[PDB]
Curated annotation (Swiss-Prot):
Innate immune receptor which acts as a cytoplasmic sensor of viral nucleic acids and plays a major role in sensing viral infection and in the activation of a cascade of antiviral responses including the induction of type I interferons and pro-inflammatory cytokines. Its ligands include mRNA lacking 2'-O-methylation at their 5' cap and long-dsRNA (>1 kb in length). The lineage of its organism: Eukaryota, Metazoa, Chordata, Craniata, Vertebrata. During apoptosis, processed into 3 cleavage products. The helicase-containing fragment, once liberated from the CARD domains, translocate from the cytoplasm to the nucleus. The processed protein significantly sensitizes cells to DNA degradation. Disulfide bonds: none annotated. Monomer in the absence of ligands and homodimerizes in the presence of dsRNA ligands. Can assemble into helical or linear polymeric filaments on long dsRNA. Interacts with MAVS/IPS1. Interacts (via the CARD domains) with TKFC, the interaction is inhibited by viral infection. Interacts with PCBP2. Interacts with NLRC5. Interacts with PIAS2-beta. Interacts with DDX60. Interacts with ANKRD17. Interacts with IKBKE. Interacts with ATG5 and ATG12, either as ATG5 and ATG12 monomers or as ATG12-ATG5 conjugates. Interacts with ZCCHC3; leading to activate IFIH1/MDA5. Interacts with RNF123. This is Interferon-induced helicase C domain-containing protein 1. The chain holds residues 548 to 697 of 1025 of the full protein. Expression is prominent in lung, liver, kidney, heart and spleen (at protein level). Widely expressed at low level. Belongs to the helicase family. RLR subfamily.
Amino acid sequence: ENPFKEKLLEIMASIQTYCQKSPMSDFGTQHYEQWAIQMEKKAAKDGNRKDRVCAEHLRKYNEALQINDTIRMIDAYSHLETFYTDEKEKKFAVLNSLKLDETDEFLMNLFFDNKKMLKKLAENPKYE
């Protein structure tokens, strides 16, 4: 049971807890991607920022699991690192809380608290 994949699954479960969602779709599937898209879409339509941003982030983790299955661990890690590095750049690069609310801080801290561990696992030839 690959520890890298297990860590990603645990993180998605933690995000689902935060936004109180519990879809029947399995993590890392196309059907999960579709659930997240609908939820993101309904959230934007209903002005629910927490749900919308959580759906967006869950999509990225779901895509990383799909990338892990079809390519390599390191492409999966990079998919997330790039997204979170960019989100960080978006948030703090230009300054006119600002764009950082409790949802944003929860999600970014969730990734960056696990970032070092994830990279260690993804760099390990044994689980590839």
